[PDB]
């Protein structure tokens, strides 16, 4: 600590190294994460005091400094001053990516490895925000450079994978947009299963979830009896099955020619 200070005031980031005029030391900048086979490293044998200047864009929470006096077998000192910096975490997520290995296998790629939670999201064709499916699903822990195995029965262009850390949204990868896209006008049905042969059918509408059959003037409530039939007839696509829940994607193209009388 008394040898390192940080100044983010010179519109850039400065590492003020407060050592004596005569001090000889090894300096190494690193990203505190397993990187693999031999990669070129950031290293400098110096004669301090020095000011190492970095760009606000280089900041990541695992960006650490290693110092050691230039003496044989000298011990190395490690400091991580960006662990809780707001800008670092900001840049970290800009550089993070979620990928598909298999439908039931996802992988997170990030420079640093922070605790994160992931869950499936449902995007409506009308531009309106992507509503996550918690419940009946849950935010499950997603670890950087480790496989996330979700029991997704089928991919859907309307499904996006959401990533949160520090209970804030950071990633929204619509994994089936190029492969199965664009967005289908399918109603999502959420049957919440429970005790005493319980199953409550609900329809994820832009204006929240509506239980079926309903007396509303809302598209899915009006078509309630028809959607309940599509499902029972097996015309609806099962996206997720569980002991206490099921997700269903019901296409609405069959109702595209239905018109109301004029009043």
């Amino acid at each position: 600590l008394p040898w390192l200070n940080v100044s983010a005031d010179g519109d850039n980031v400065h590492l003020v190294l407060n050592v004596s005029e005569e001090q000889h030391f090894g300096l190494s900048l690193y990203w505190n994460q397993v990187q693999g086979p031999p990669k070129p490293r950031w290293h400098k044998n110096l004669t301090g005091p020095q000011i190492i200047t970095l760009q606000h864009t280089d900041l990541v929470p695992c960006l650490c400094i290693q110092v050691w006096p230039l003496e044989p077998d000298s011990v190395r000192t490690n400091i991580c001053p960006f662990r809780e910096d707001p800008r670092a975490h900001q840049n970290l997520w800009q550089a993070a990516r979620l990928r598909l290995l298999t439908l039931q296998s996802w992988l997170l790629d990030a420079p640093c490895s922070l605790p994160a939670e992931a869950a499936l999201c449902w995007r409506a064709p009308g531009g309106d925000p992507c509503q996550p499916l918690v419940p009946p699903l849950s935010w499950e822990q997603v670890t950087v450079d480790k496989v996330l195995e979700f029991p997704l029965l089928k991919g859907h262009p309307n499904l996006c994978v959401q990533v949160q850390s520090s209970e804030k949204l950071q990633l929204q990868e619509c994994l089936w947009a190029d492969s199965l896209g664009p967005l289908k006008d399918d109603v999502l049905l959420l049957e919440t299963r429970g005790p005493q042969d319980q199953r409550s059918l609900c329809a994820l509408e832009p204006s929240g979830c509506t239980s079926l059959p309903s007396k509303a003037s809302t598209r899915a409530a009006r078509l309630g009896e028809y959607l309940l039939q599509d499902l029972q007839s097996g015309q609806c696509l099962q996206l997720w099955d569980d002991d206490l829940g099921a997700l269903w994607a019901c296409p609405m193209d069959k109702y595209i020619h239905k018109r109301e009388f004029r009043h």
């Epitope: 003037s217 409530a221 018109r259 109301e260 009388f261 009043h263």
Partner: antibody
Framework: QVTLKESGPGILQPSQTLSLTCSFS??????????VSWIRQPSGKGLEWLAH???????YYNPSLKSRLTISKDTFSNQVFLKITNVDTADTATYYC???????????WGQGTSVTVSS | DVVMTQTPLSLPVSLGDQASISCRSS???????????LHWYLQKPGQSPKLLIY???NRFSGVPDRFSGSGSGTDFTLKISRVEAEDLGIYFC?????????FGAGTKLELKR
Amino acid sequence: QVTLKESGPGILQPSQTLSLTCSFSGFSLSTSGMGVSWIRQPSGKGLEWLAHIYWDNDRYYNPSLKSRLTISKDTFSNQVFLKITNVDTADTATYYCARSPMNTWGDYWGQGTSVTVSS
Amino acid sequence: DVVMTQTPLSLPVSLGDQASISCRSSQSLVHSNGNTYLHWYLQKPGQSPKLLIYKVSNRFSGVPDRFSGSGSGTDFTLKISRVEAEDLGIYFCSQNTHVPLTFGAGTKLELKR
């Protein structure tokens, strides 16, 4: 009182064109909101709506019969018409016209005209 | 098409009795404008249908207080309080929320003996 009277040939052969006329009194198709619908009823069966026309000439048809129906009107003569092309036995019915303004669809019906389609 | 399921199809009653007729639609009759275009008609032999109730519960001009309509969404009921001989005939429900406009099969209100 509102009165409507349907007219047309009593018997036609299959493939012929049925031309129906609804002559009315007690209302005008120049009146904003006013409309007239055509409905049919095969003997001892349920009613089947055919077509509707509003005062502004907006027209609606039964989608299953759409290509065979044409509804039209003559406001000056107080008449509404229905043309049904390529008739067949299923077109055998009593045909009704009914005053159908925007708030009260089919609020006054004519006494109907019987049509038999047979070879 | 919106199917109008009318029950019972035959309704034997005694004069002075109350009669109840049910109409269930295959989908909600609530229009985008918020109204429910469900009507009840009576048809007598050799005669044309006469409008009794419009928009679920509104009695048409000249219709007696003994006729009342109720219900919402997909479930509707016509109640006739003190059945008279002039009430005997076929009652039908109709909807005009959706194109095509559709009707129930009819309930024949008949006399018991």
